[PDB]
């Protein structure tokens, strides 16, 4: 029986609870362990991931980015309904993608200050368990589908730089932030 409520203010905190890890760090290249229990301890980690994400001005955050080896993503990208609930994906699975390939600028909380173009399918269908353990299914397009695919990549040890086709732009953007092109990995 759940006794932790996920009711996190969308506000930056003076002292965010979890620490980010950055391109180069091996934690970002470890495929994530499946979650065995969706319980109150996990929900406290969900709250802390949200607080960390809001504090770093992000829209999505995967557990490995904060050093937590779990198939767990939080997303909150709605602009219009300011207080809409965040999307919590536990043990997600991409069922299929659809639509055309679209190229858009992406950033990442684990690669601060790097913004590069990435091509992805415009539509994704994902199955998952929510923060209450209930099975769910979602079809998404636009920014939501993009963020889902980016965050799913984190659970497989894949970073958006791995999908960047422009060598000039990749190298220039990494170098100026102290990141190494050698930390990039090919796409499976
Ligand atoms: Zn990311």
Which residues are within 8 A (CB) of 96 and not within 5 positions of it... i.e. 6 or more apart? 124, 125
Q: What is the Å distance from ligand 1's center to 1 Cα?
A: 32
Q: Is 162 helix (H, G, I), strand (E, B) or coil?
A: helix
DSSP 32-86: PPPP---SHHHHHHHHHHHHHHHHTT-SEEEGGGGT--SSEEEE---SSSTTPPP
Sort 149 into a burial class: Cβ within 10 Å, 0-12 / 13-18 / 19+. buried
CA of 173 to the centre of ligand 1 (A): 16
**Residues with CB in 5 Å of ion ligand 1:** 108
Q: How many residues does the chain have?
A: 188
| Phi, psi dihedral angles at 39 (to 5 degrees) | -140, -170
- What angle is formed at CA 127 by the lines to CA 124 and CA 132, rounded to 5 degrees? 130
- In order of their start, the domains of the chain are 1-188 (3.90.45.10)
Rounded Cα distance between 112 and 100, Å, is: 28
Q: Which DSSP string do the residues of 82-115 spell out, in sequence order?
A: TTPPPEEEEEEEEEEEEEEEEEEEE--TTSTT--
Elucidation method: X-ray
Resolution in A: 1.5
Check 151, 165, 169, 172 and give the catalytic one.
151
Q: Which residues contact 9 (CB under 8 A, 6 or more apart)?
A: 54
Residue 151: active-site member: yes
């Amino acid at each position: 029986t759940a006794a932790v409520a996920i009711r996190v203010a969308k506000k930056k905190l003076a002292k965010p609870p979890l620490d980010l890890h950055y391109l180069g760090d091996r934690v970002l290249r470890q495929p994530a362990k499946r979650v065995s229990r969706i319980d109150d301890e996990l929900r406290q980690t969900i709250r802390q991931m949200l607080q960390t994400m809001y504090s770093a001005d992000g829209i999505g955050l995967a557990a490995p980015q904060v050093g937590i080896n779990k198939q767990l993503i939080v997303i909150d990208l709605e602009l219009e309904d300011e207080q809409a609930p965040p999307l919590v994906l536990i043990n997600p699975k991409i069922e299929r993608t659809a639509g055309d390939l679209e190229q858009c600028q992406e950033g990442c909380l684990s690669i601060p200050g790097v913004y590069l173009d990435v091509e992805r399918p415009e539509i994704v269908e994902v199955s998952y368990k929510d923060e209450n353990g209930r099975p769910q299914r979602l079809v998404a397009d636009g920014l939501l589908a993009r963020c889902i695919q980016h965050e799913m990549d984190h659970l497989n040890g894949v970073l958006f730089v791995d999908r960047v086709e422009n060598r000039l732009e990749l190298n220039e953007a990494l170098d100026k932030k102290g990141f190494a092109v050698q930390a990039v990995r090919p796409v499976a």
